């Protein structure tokens, strides 16, 4: 799926994404990203033979900061993409009444089915 108003620069997030609410701090996805950064720092201390859980706390803090920052911007991009998908979908629902009719909600007083008993 492509443009969708192909003026469209490279544009990592438009100004229209500042209308939807931004992702909160300590949302569980960025907490999972922080845990993944801490596991990255632990295993980085494990690749070289420096001791684990020590001697790299500035690298631990750098990894956590870098992953949480990048994941924050990617989550804002995710929210923008889902918002524009729903906006385009409901615009197409409103723009064409013919193909999407009201279905007759026949209640179960008059809807017949087969039965097929398991004896």
The residues near 37 (Cβ < 8 Å, ≥ 6 apart) are 63, 64, 66, 67, 68
Query: Residue 54 carries which DSSP code?
Result: S
Task: Tell me if 9 contacts another protein by CB under 8 A.
Answer: yes
Residue among 98, 99, 102, 113 that touches another protein (CB under 8 A): 113
> 83 with 20: CB under 8 angstroms?
yes
**What is residue 7's three-state secondary structure?**
coil
Question: Could you tell me how many helices (H) and strands (E) the chain has, helices first?
Answer: 2, 0
Q: Is 18 a binder of another protein (CB under 8 A)?
A: yes
The CB-of-29 to another protein minimum distance in angstroms stands at: 7
The residue count for the chain:
119
Interaction between residue 104 and another protein (CB under 8 A): no
Name residues contacting another protein, limited to 19-78 (CB under 8 A): 19-22, 25, 29, 32, 36, 39-41, 43-44, 46-51, 53-59, 61-63, 65-66, 68-69, 72, 74, 77-78
Which residue is it, tokens 């999972």?
A: 32
Residues that bind another protein in the complex, under the rule CB under 8 A: 1-2, 4, 8-10, 18-22, 25, 29, 32, 36, 39-41, 43-44, 46-51, 53-59, 61-63, 65-66, 68-69, 72, 74, 77-78, 81-82, 85, 109-110, 112-114, 116, 118
């Amino acid at each position: 799926m492509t443009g969708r108003q192909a003026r469209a620069p490279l544009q990592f997030l438009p100004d229209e994404a500042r209308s939807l609410p931004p992702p909160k701090l300590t949302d569980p996805r960025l907490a999972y990203i922080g845990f993944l950064g801490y596991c990255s720092g632990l295993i980085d201390n494990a690749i070289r033979r420096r001791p684990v859980l020590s001697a790299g706390l500035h690298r631990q803090f750098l990894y956590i900061t870098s992953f949480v920052f990048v994941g924050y911007y990617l989550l804002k991009r995710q929210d923008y993409m889902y918002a524009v998908r729903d906006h385009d979908m409901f615009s197409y629902i409103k723009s064409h009444p013919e193909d999407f009719p009201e279905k007759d909600k026949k209640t179960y007083r008059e809807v017949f089915e087969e039965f097929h008993p398991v004896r």
